[PDB]
Amino acid sequence: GYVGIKIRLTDVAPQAQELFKKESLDVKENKVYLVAATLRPETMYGQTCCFVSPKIDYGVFDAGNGDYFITTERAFKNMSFQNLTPKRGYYKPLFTINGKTLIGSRIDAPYAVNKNLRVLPMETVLATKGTGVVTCVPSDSPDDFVTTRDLANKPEYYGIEKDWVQTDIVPIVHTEKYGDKCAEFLVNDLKIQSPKDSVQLANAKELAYKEGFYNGTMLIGKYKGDKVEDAAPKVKQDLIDEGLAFVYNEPE
Numbered sequence: 001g002y003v004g005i006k007i008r009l010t011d012v013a014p015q016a017q018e019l020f021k022k023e024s025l026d027v028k029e030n031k032v033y034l035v036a037a038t039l040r041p042e043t044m045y046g047q048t049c050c051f052v053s054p055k056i057d058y059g060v061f062d063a064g065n066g067d068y069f070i071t072t073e074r075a076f077k078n079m080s081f082q083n084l085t086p087k088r089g090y091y092k093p094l095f096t097i098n099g100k101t102l103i104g105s106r107i108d109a110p111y112a113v114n115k116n117l118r119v120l121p122m123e124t125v126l127a128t129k130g131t132g133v134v135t136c137v138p139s140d141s142p143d144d145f146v147t148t149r150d151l152a153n154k155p156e157y158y159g160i161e162k163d164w165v166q167t168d169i170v171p172i173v174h175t176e177k178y179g180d181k182c183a184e185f186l187v188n189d190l191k192i193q194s195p196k197d198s199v200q201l202a203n204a205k206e207l208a209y210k211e212g213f214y215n216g217t218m219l220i221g222k223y224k225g226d227k228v229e230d231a232a233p234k235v236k237q238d239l240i241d242e243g244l245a246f247v248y249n250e251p252e
């Protein structure tokens with residue numbers, strides 16, 4: 001399974017405003033969330049944006065009790081089978097929305113120390129994995145770092161504005177092998193120049209995880225100074241207790 005991170009949609013992008021208005025779904029009154037799937041809840045302090053795929057047609061689903069989730073239909077269907085939605089096996093969204101239509105939207109990500117976060121495009125989101133929504137932690141995720149780099153280097157070309165992408169990375173996890181921004185270290189060390197270098201990125205991802213999780217120390221938050229291995233389950237439970245996240249499993 002995954003930890004679903006409830007990223008609050010505070011302001012919708014101009015191209016999506018006419019869509020949300022037609023549905024009578026005010027993001028100021030109602031709680032509309034992009035639900036990002038993560039296995040690294042301890043890294044939520046370093047969220048710099050939320051990624052959606054331009055290729056994916058997301059659903060806006062009734063999550064019950066005034067909540068609304070933006071995910072793939074596959075993911076929401078899975079959530080319905082484990083008491084996270086109003087009705088078991090019901091997964092028709094209120095409406096469908098392409099990832100491109102959400103780009104530029106403003107969001108509030110749980111535990112993120114950086115402010116003024118935006119929804120940005122990620123071309124390499126695997127549509128059949130998790131929720132199809134990926135939160136961006138460039139300090140420790142090689143995929144997120146390489147995607148952020150390309151967006152920051154040619155923002156207008158990528159259909160975004162300069163101020164929407166954040167490059168001033170706040171360190172979250174200290175490591176002995178790769179310093180305090182292991183993803184930056186590893187992307188440079190392995191000379192990964194494109195987000196589509198899947199084989200090398202998978203290598204970097206695993207190296208970053210093993211060192212950061214098993215040997216890393218938290219640099220921020222309630223568990224600053226603690227080993228990541230000890231802190232991670234505590235951060236996860238805190239997020240769940242505070243209504244900012246939840247766990248959900250998949251078939252098989």
Ligand SMILES: Nc1ncnc2c1ncn2[C@@H]1O[C@H](COP(=O)(O)O)[C@H]2O[B@-]3(OCc4cc(F)ccc43)O[C@H]21
Binds near residue numbers: 127
């Ligand atoms: N549909 C998708 N397409 C591409 N990537 C996706 C995705 N859904 C989630 N992810 C990414 O893969 C991680 C789980 O890795 P495995 O399952 O073990 O491969 C998740 O945790 B992680 O979230 C924040 C984070 C920080 C970090 F320092 C490292 C990783 C992540 O990035 C997410």
